[PDB]
Design an enzyme around this catalytic site. Structure first.
Site, PDB file in Angstrom:
ATOM      1  N   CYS A 179      23.775 -42.565  23.025  1.00  0.00           N
ATOM      2  CA  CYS A 179      23.719 -43.240  21.730  1.00  0.00           C
ATOM      3  C   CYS A 179      24.149 -42.298  20.610  1.00  0.00           C
ATOM      4  O   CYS A 179      24.982 -42.621  19.802  1.00  0.00           O
ATOM      5  CB  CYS A 179      22.321 -43.801  21.503  1.00  0.00           C
ATOM      6  SG  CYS A 179      20.993 -42.599  21.703  1.00  0.00           S
TER       7      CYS A 179
ATOM      8  N   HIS B 212      15.573 -39.286  15.390  1.00  0.00           N
ATOM      9  CA  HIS B 212      15.764 -40.278  16.428  1.00  0.00           C
ATOM     10  C   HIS B 212      14.418 -40.943  16.796  1.00  0.00           C
ATOM     11  O   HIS B 212      13.372 -40.299  16.900  1.00  0.00           O
ATOM     12  CB  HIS B 212      16.379 -39.524  17.621  1.00  0.00           C
ATOM     13  CG  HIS B 212      16.931 -40.366  18.729  1.00  0.00           C
ATOM     14  ND1 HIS B 212      16.156 -41.197  19.517  1.00  0.00           N
ATOM     15  CD2 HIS B 212      18.189 -40.420  19.254  1.00  0.00           C
ATOM     16  CE1 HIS B 212      16.923 -41.783  20.423  1.00  0.00           C
ATOM     17  NE2 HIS B 212      18.162 -41.327  20.285  1.00  0.00           N
TER      18      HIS B 212
END
Ligand SMILES: NC(=O)c1ccc[n+]([C@@H]2O[C@H](COP(=O)([O-])OP(=O)(O)OC[C@H]3O[C@@H](n4cnc5c(N)ncnc54)[C@H](O)[C@@H]3O)[C@@H](O)[C@H]2O)c1
Ligand SMILES: NC(=O)c1ccc[n+]([C@@H]2O[C@H](COP(=O)([O-])OP(=O)(O)OC[C@H]3O[C@@H](n4cnc5c(N)ncnc54)[C@H](O)[C@@H]3O)[C@@H](O)[C@H]2O)c1
Ligand SMILES: NC(=O)c1ccc[n+]([C@@H]2O[C@H](COP(=O)([O-])OP(=O)(O)OC[C@H]3O[C@@H](n4cnc5c(N)ncnc54)[C@H](O)[C@@H]3O)[C@@H](O)[C@H]2O)c1
Ligand SMILES: NC(=O)c1ccc[n+]([C@@H]2O[C@H](COP(=O)([O-])OP(=O)(O)OC[C@H]3O[C@@H](n4cnc5c(N)ncnc54)[C@H](O)[C@@H]3O)[C@@H](O)[C@H]2O)c1
Lengths: 337, 336, 337, 336
Positions: free
Chosen positions: C151, C178
């Site tokens: 990602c 994150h």
């Protein structure tokens, strides 16, 4: 001829049991966890997100964990039958892995050299004890494998005992609003045996079954058929609260309920059941060693016979203290030979 | 000749009421909030942490908020008596500021031009309504200021009505495990009127009052003296759940409880009370428009006369839809 | 002669890949997960704490998962070599278990009948691709096992490509703030390979290593030696943000940076890289299908050659969309026969 | 003949300053907060969601707060000019309300009887100090109102000083991943001066300003034009971390960076800057009194002249200790 302790599963309970043993001067001779090597045990014991840094020295050497200069043997076994308990002189063993809950599963510790086992959870068949409620029913000659019930049972049972003995519980239903635990998931994942428990722990209020209220009727047999309950897991990391809604046999003005709870707290349940009238919230019980802290201002009386009683508990820390108290109690009784 | 709505207090409820009005074709003619300018209202309405981006167009121009091409006047007044409700043709006013709860405080809207006021909270004296429970007691002749009770009342009252009418509630106590709200604090701060409410909302389970404790027996007078309760505020941003423990007069095996709730949900309380047997958790009700969603599998019975019943609610979204449903109901009755 | 898809590991990515396939009209023929039976798959797919209820029909019957009337075979295998991919006509397989990351591990899918494998994570050796950056380097005749990177790489690489091609990146260091993931723990527990990652996910800011910035230099070889970075895991359940601090070769007034990013977003990186000037926060990107959303107002320029650029990404949802895009791209290229 | 302290604004910083004063033997003679009465101050000081129960006695009587038998006068004033500082013998005043940041706003304390004022935040014009970095620039003759900068400035400046003095910072940019604070909101609400700051604090990663962006080059003037940065507010209730990315003039292999920080931590910056090589996370710094704790293992180098350095801080607790350290320093210098 002193109590010695072995811990199987060095998790939230296992590590906090070691903290309590250090505080209470109980000798821990060995810790077993196949997922945590000795050097990593130092780190996991030293630093705690919930309960802060351990206030003392933690080091490793010679394959051992050394806490405040006490040397603790470290084993790395995946099955109780593999653990060399005889090597450390037949200790009393805390079974805090979460996966050996029956007499049959826990009995492998005995055959590996454990003198006794205390399962740190409810058992389907081992006898269960809650300090301040039924520890006198322990029998040194017949029980080598016992259970210290659950955190919720340890909160509910002392309060239920006080209320039932003073007023009579006709019937009661409980809820616990409970912090998330290690069995839960950070994000939605698999939990085939209990689907809601797979759902993200930090995002959700999660209903969850618990045998904890009925468990109070194994430890208080007079309440058989009269108490059950359930849980909501919520996004806090520790500390939980019991909400007990009960119908009482004798009139119980809330002033009389407060006086009964206070009398128990000052006397026979000292250290187990406490009483506050302060405007408390969950974080106020982080590190509290009581099993049950009655919240006087939070409860409600609909009438003299129908009430909602509220009691707090640090599910990690209070329970870990009770594990140690039960071990010490067992040992003092076992001296009956 | 048509319902028009003014919103005072463009907050969680105020914005979600505007969303509900947009969804249900109700004309909003004005929004008042002294702390949010038109350009800022665009941003606060367009983006929502809990309920996602508004699915439509949101713009400002000429001192107006424009949603899906509907022009909404934006006022900036600190007191109801300052708001120019006559300029937008005597709308029905939602009072969603949280600070004008009495008939006396709310009446300044009427004298400023409002046709009616719906207070988006329990009131000490204004008559309170829960759709599906007592809306028929609204009297157009004599009630220009009303209250839509609270979110918890809107969850509890429909369920309590069903259970009481079928089995008879002898006595009951309830708890709501409730998401935090705008009255709470990010970190421990002052709340002199309710000390526990000042404690960090994201860190704590916080015992608190619920508007439902007092409101439920105003909307269901037959339960007066038989039902009250409390709240625990916990670290979720929306969706709450009622846990109702009651002693029942008639035998109420749990199969019969389920059939009674189903019947109500499929029938007279359709859109208000729902029924599920799925393994639900709080996030599963984000954006649900029902007042009360009965959770069949979560409940427990001790015996045939003593039971614990569980019902969910999106405290922001369900309640906002009920505000709009009450406005439309009032408008239809005011034509008499 | 149409793309068909098999999913191994029906987790956050696996389920959201299925959602994306449904949205994009890509045929999913089978799902494998040994921890989720068909009836339980219905529940896990239908209800999502982060992305809401699936908007369509979900049912099971005949040992199958049925989504919007599309029948999907459900397998229950613990090892790729056990999965009967030939039974469903040699699909392209998404490897989203997290545990089969190498060519060697993933190759068992090929020998079990998979036509291709897309590993839903960085691989130590399979070739890696980021849509909008290097997908043209895929070779149908030589690669049956590929990786869609991470990602973070999918967020960073498109932005780094735009900036490097317009201005020249001399050197850069990145941080990603994150959201927590399934590999993390609800409460402090064991993570022997990465100790900080064991610490309670909901309580902590947690530093964590990531090869994601250097990974951008596998997909953009001109940046070898010029980019690396790290992560902080924080208590949100989805959506993350890249903070790239870079020194540029040519002067890059922030107005010129915004114009370059916009030009890329409107043109060659349409659907991959987006551009906003709104006052956004993380929840504003829940469900966003872009790989990278450049936050114009959040960045800072110290001077014309030294800047901090900020870009958002829904780490679950954007990435799952890119997995599907890569599959469709591979299939259109593989038609070269 | 002795340091006495008055606190205006009994909030996160104000209460933790009183805790620090109790720990370090500094006499607090008065606390002012119009939103917290004496009996309520007992509760707010005794119980803390983040830092635990006060380990000592806390009582009220005779309109006073009594901590470990020390009587503290409690005032209830909304404006500094109202506070009777002369009644408690011209204390040194901590200005920790958040709303009196300029020399002009803070001077009302002086004319109400304060000897000195320490503003617990960056100021547009009052001189700013970071212990371990520039306290020696305090001039008793001419500075009755000063600022202790911000928490992030107190983390960043000691580290930046060490790195700049050893290797030379050519240019740098920083980020702080920062816990939410009292200025933020539990759910999306109004923040007209900083829109992202209104968004739900517990739900979001929120880009924001940091006081350190402007303050760091006031306290280290040699870095003017060479360093700035920003914040992301995230869902933790305390403890934050600085991520400083800098280009360095002299070769700075990471071993040399570690030796430079260690030397500072063991020497001139002892108690201010610490050094760890443990696998730490944010909760590990709850209650840490250091300004800046360098995280050796979390940092990364691209090469010998371009590096990312990581340093932790308890934004509430470390900063409160520094406020007390600055007061004691000022008092010792004011004897000249
Ligand atoms: N956390 C609570 O609030 C709480 C309170 C009371 C009782 N309990 C019970 O205590 C027990 C442990 O709970 P926990 O919260 O500490 O869980 P945990 O997951 O934190 O700890 C379990 C530990 O057991 C270790 N382990 C796993 N398998 C093992 C094995 N085969 N052999 C040896 N060690 C093994 C794990 O590596 C881990 O360190 C469970 O029965 C739980 O129900 C938990
Ligand atoms: N949030 C819920 O779950 C919920 C549910 C049901 C009912 N309510 C009730 O709805 C009301 C609003 O709650 P909320 O959660 O939307 O709060 P909120 O804080 O989100 O919204 C209140 C809004 O009123 C505005 N405001 C404040 N003072 C004002 C004034 N004097 N004049 C005009 N506007 C003013 C504020 O700027 C803000 O936008 C309260 O009475 C609350 O009890 C809340
Ligand atoms: N979540 C993110 O943000 C993200 C983003 C990009 C890439 N990824 C990568 O995607 C992969 C999966 O991540 P996730 O977040 O979906 O994890 P997850 O834990 O949510 O999903 C893993 C799934 O694999 C299943 N599984 C485990 N062992 C298996 C086996 N042997 N065979 C088949 N299935 C098995 C599990 O039961 C689970 O449903 C990992 O490589 C991860 O690094 C994750
Ligand atoms: N929290 C942190 O991490 C931190 C760190 C360093 C500096 N600061 C700075 O410290 C200051 C206080 O921050 P805080 O986090 O303690 O905020 P806070 O909201 O917790 O505390 C402010 C206190 O001031 C009181 N107050 C408000 N108006 C007042 C007035 N007019 N007169 C007297 N008292 C008043 C409030 O009742 C409250 O108790 C701000 O300038 C903030 O930027 C905060």
């Amino acid at each position: 001829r002193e109590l010695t302790v072995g811990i199987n599963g060095f998790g939230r309970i296992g590590r906090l049991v070691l903290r309590a043993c250090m505080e209470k001067g109980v000798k821990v001779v060995a810790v077993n966890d196949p997922f945590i090597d000795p050097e990593y045990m130092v780190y996991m014991f030293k630093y705690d997100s919930t309960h802060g840094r351990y206030k003392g020295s933690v080091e490793f050497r010679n394959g051992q964990l050394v806490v405040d200069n006490h040397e603790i043997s470290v084993y790395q076994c995946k099955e109780p039958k593999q653990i060399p308990w005889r090597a450390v002189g037949s200790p009393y063993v805390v079974e805090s892995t979460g996966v050996y809950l029956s007499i049959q599963a826990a009995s492998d510790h005995i055959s590996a050299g454990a003198q006794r086992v205390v399962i740190s959870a409810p058992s389907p068949d081992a006898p269960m004890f809650v300090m301040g409620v039924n520890e006198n029913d322990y029998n040194p000659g017949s029980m080598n494998i016992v259970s210290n019930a659950s955190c919720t049972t340890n909160c509910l049972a002392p309060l239920a005992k006080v209320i039932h003995e003073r007023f009579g519980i006709v019937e009661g239903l409980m809820t616990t609003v409970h912090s998330y635990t290690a069995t839960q998931k950070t994000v939605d994942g698999p939990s085939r045996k209990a689907w809601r428990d797979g759902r993200g722990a930090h995002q959700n209020i999660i209903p969850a079954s618990t045998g904890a209220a009925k468990a109070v009727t194994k430890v208080i047999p007079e309440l058989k058929g009269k108490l059950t309950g359930m849980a909501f897991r919520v996004p806090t990391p520790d500390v939980s609260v019991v909400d007990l809604t009960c119908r009482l046999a004798q009139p119980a003005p809330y002033s009389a309920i407060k006086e009964a709870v206070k009398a128990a707290a000052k006397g026979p349940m000292a250290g187990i059941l406490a009483y506050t009238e302060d405007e408390v919230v969950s974080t106020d019980f982080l590190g509290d060693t009581h099993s049950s802290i009655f919240d006087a201002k939070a409860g409600i009386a609909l009438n003299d016979n129908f009430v909602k009683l509220i009691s707090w508990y640090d599910n990690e820390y209070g329970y870990s203290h009770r594990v140690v108290d039960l071990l010490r109690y067992m040992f003092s009784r076992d001296a009956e030979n």
